[PDB]
Structure formats: C-alpha cells, structure tokens
Amino acid sequence: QFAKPEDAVKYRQSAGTLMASHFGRMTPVVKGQAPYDAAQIKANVEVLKTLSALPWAAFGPGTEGGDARPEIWSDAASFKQKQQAFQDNIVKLSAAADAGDLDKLRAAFGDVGASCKACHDAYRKK
C-alpha cells in the first residue's frame, strides 16, 4: 500500500507511536496510582490488539529506512518469531483484560513490555 519506501517508514513509525500511547497509558493503572476500571481497560486493550498487528506489514519488500536495522529483512524468520511472540503476549494481555483480572493484567503487561524492548534492542537503531 506504499507508493515509496518512505511511506512504509512513516506508517510503521506512526503505528509505533499509537502503540506506545495505548500501552503506556496503562502504566499508572498497573502500578495502582490510577484506579482500575475493568471495562475501560478492556476497551483500551482491544484498541492495542488492533494496533499491535499493524507494523509488521510495513516492513515489506524494499521498505528499508528509518530506524529499522538492516537485520530485519536478512533474518526474516528471527524477526517474524519476535513479532509473533509479541502478538502472543498481546493475546495474553487481552485475556487478562477481558477477564477483568488486575493481578493477571499486571503480569501480562510486564510480559508485553519486555517483548517490545527485546525487539527494539535487536532490530531498532540506536
């Protein structure tokens, strides 16, 4: 869907921006510094679920650039494993939210955050 590689870069960076907001806005809730409303979090995690599937298709043929490290395309299976595992972690966060289980949410939230960081550490330029 991208006329030029720059358009893929702009897309995936914007998807990252929105994921960071929908993930990070729950930090005060997970820490107990903001109240826990199960319906609010369920709805927010649904948004995050949708967003979480979006970046990967924007690292397609010839879309090199931005802060993507070149190791993304040459090791296609290792990068894939990481995005599929991140989305696995998102499924677990969805389950916690959908159940209205705050302890479960805390734990799942930490696992998601670790998955974001693991990918950035390997595949995003400093």
Which helix (H) or strand (E) segment holds residue 95: the answer is: helix 76-99
- Residue 38 CA to residue 35 CA, distance in Å, equals 10
Q: Which two tokens stand for residue 74?
A: 């040459």
Which helix (H) or strand (E) segment holds residue 59: the answer is: none
**Considering only residues 45-104, where is the footprint of ligand HEC by CB under 6 A?**
66-68, 82-83, 86
Q: Which does 18 bind (CB under 5 to 8 A by kind): a second copy, ligand HEC, none?
A: a second copy
Q: Which does 109 bind (CB under 5 to 8 A by kind): ligand HEC, a second copy, none?
A: none
Q: Which two tokens stand for residue 56?
A: 């990967």
Does residue 84 belong to the site contacting a second copy (CB under 8 A)? no
Q: Which residues bind a second copy (CB under 8 A)?
A: 1-2, 7, 10-11, 13-15, 17-18, 21, 24-25, 47, 50, 54
